[PDB]
Design a binder for this molecule. Structure first.
Ligand SMILES: Cc1cn([C@H]2C[C@H](OP(=O)(O)O)[C@@H](COP(=O)(O)O)O2)c(=O)[nH]c1=O
Ligand SMILES: [Ca+2]
Length: 129
């Protein structure tokens, strides 16, 4: 898999972010995770975490997996990196997201994220508390 450039247009919530990718604005949905919606428990903390992470990055990168790159709502499906740290993994590791939506052939980083979830659960972080 390959990291591609992008620039933040706007933070949205725990598992979506608006980025300019190949010069076009797009909403990206983070692969392999699910954050609570803003109005549910840990929802505001997940949004806040993701926001900070994307707003502080000097470099944002998009990494598509091997399968579909856009979902049925037209959102980009990617692993997103902020200064080389994966947003998807960071949210899971903090117990602000669960591993979820694991479809065959867009699941390269499945085991990496499950490992982060196991550590977050061990530490009883946030969602696991
Ligand atoms: C993460 C992801 C979500 N989706 C779709 C599945 C869900 O359909 P439904 O809307 O029909 O439930 C929805 C979940 O996204 P959200 O968690 O952003 O709502 O997005 C995919 O199709 N592919 C994926 O890789
Ligand atoms: Ca969600």
């Amino acid at each position: 898999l390959h990291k591609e450039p992008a620039t933040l247009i706007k933070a949205i919530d725990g598992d979506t972010v608006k980025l300019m990718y190949k010069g076009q604005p797009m909403t990206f949905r983070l692969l392999l995770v699910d954050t609570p919606e803003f109005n549910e428990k840990y929802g505001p903390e997940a949004s806040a975490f993701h926001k900070k992470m994307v707003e502080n990055a000097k470099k944002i990168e998009v990494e598509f997996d091997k399968g579909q790159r856009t979902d049925k709502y037209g959102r980009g499906l990617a692993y997103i990196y902020a200064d080389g740290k994966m947003d998807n993994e960071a949210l899971v590791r903090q117990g602000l997201a669960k591993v979820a939506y694991v479809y065959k052939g867009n699941n390269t980083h499945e085991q990496l994220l499950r490992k982060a979830e196991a550590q977050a659960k061990k530490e009883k972080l946030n969602i696991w508390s």
